[PDB]
């Protein structure tokens, strides 16, 4: 639900302004763009 596009931090401007800060809010919370994929969560859930 946080990977949707209408979140304020998912916009291009926010990502550009907060691409070098290592402790940004999205990075701190663990949810960000993740443009590649999200696989190992599925692997862990299925293994469990």
């Amino acid at each position: 639900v946080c990977q949707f596009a209408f979140m304020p931090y998912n916009s291009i401007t926010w990502r550009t302004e907060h691409q070098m800060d290592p402790m940004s809010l999205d990075k701190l919370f663990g949810v960000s763009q993740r443009d590649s994929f999200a696989l190992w969560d599925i692997v862990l859930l299925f293994s469990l």
């Binding site: 291009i12 401007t13 550009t16 691409q19």
Partner: protein
């Protein structure tokens, strides 16, 4: 584990002072300068040289971060690189220099030397316009020297006969004929700790191929692409009296959209009304001991 800590504490990072005096020279190679100017400032009260105000830096950052299209992927990388490079310097490490448009000294050239210039500019000789920038910092007792960074750019005068005749007529003293020098002083320059003036290639690429009036760079050499984002200069001769005084007025003109938000707005002189010559310098203040 004592040698490692000893080495770590022994080595530190120093700091070099903010540069003080900036000089500009425009000339024809092998001849006295056409336009010599210099600027020194107190950095807090002078207007010819001073730190960038936070509002201007914020506006420049916003203009740089909003310069992309929502279709092409590579523009995202260019904008990100430009913003990341700009974010490396705070508002204290960036300065603004405003050269006066008018020449500082009267043109000290002999009649025979001017005739020699006209002859050299006549038949087939390829002369190059030379533009030199120089930054010098205050003396530091640590190193018994005064750090000084200088850069010189040479631009050809082309082989077109009608252009050379116009330039010769302008140099002779005929009124109503300007001299146009493309690829002149850069709007943004970077001074390193020990090297020479290095261009901000990321901002140059953004200007070249990120604005709406894209600048064509198909038929150009590699050494010209980095120079393709420079601004043009126009030099006019004002004489007034008979002889013994000849003034050169230089005016800059940005390439592409002259009213784009990327460029820093210029100021007008308080004694004549002609616009200043703006140069934005990024200063590195770290040397590895």
């Amino acid at each position: 584990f004592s040698p490692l800590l000893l080495w770590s504490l022994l080595n530190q990072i120093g700091t070099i002072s903010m540069p003080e005096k900036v000089t500009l020279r425009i000339s024809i190679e092998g001849y006295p300068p056409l336009y010599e100017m210099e600027a020194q400032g107190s950095n807090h009260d002078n207007a010819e040289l001073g730190m960038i105000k936070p509002d201007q830096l914020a506006s420049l950052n916003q203009a740089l971060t909003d310069s992309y299209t929502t279709r092409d992927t590579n523009s995202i990388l260019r904008s990100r690189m430009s913003v990341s490079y700009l974010k490396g310097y705070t508002y204290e490490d960036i300065l603004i220099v405003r050269f006066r448009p008018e020449s500082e000294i009267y043109w000290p050239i002999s009649q025979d030397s001017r005739n020699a210039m006209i002859d050299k500019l006549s038949r087939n000789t390829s002369v190059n316009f030379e533009v030199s920038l120089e930054f010098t910092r205050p003396y530091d007792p640590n190193e018994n020297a005064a750090l000084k960074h200088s850069k010189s750019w040479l631009v050809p005068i082309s082989l077109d006969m009608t252009i050379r005749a116009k330039i010769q007529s302008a140099l002779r003293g005929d009124p109503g004929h300007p001299i146009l020098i493309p690829q002149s002083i850069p709007a943004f320059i970077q001074v390193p700790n020990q090297g020479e003036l290095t261009l901000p290639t990321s901002i140059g690429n953004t200007i070249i191929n990120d604005g709406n009036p894209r600048i064509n760079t198909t038929g150009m050499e590699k050494s010209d692409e980095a120079r393709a984002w420079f601004d043009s200069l126009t030099l006019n001769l004002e004489q007034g009296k008979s002889q013994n005084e000849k003034m050169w007025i230089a005016t800059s003109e940005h390439p592409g959209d002259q009213n784009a938000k990327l460029w820093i707005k210029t100021a007008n002189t308080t004694y004549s009304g002609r616009p200043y010559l703006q140069v934005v310098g990024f200063i590195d203040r770290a040397f590895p001991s």
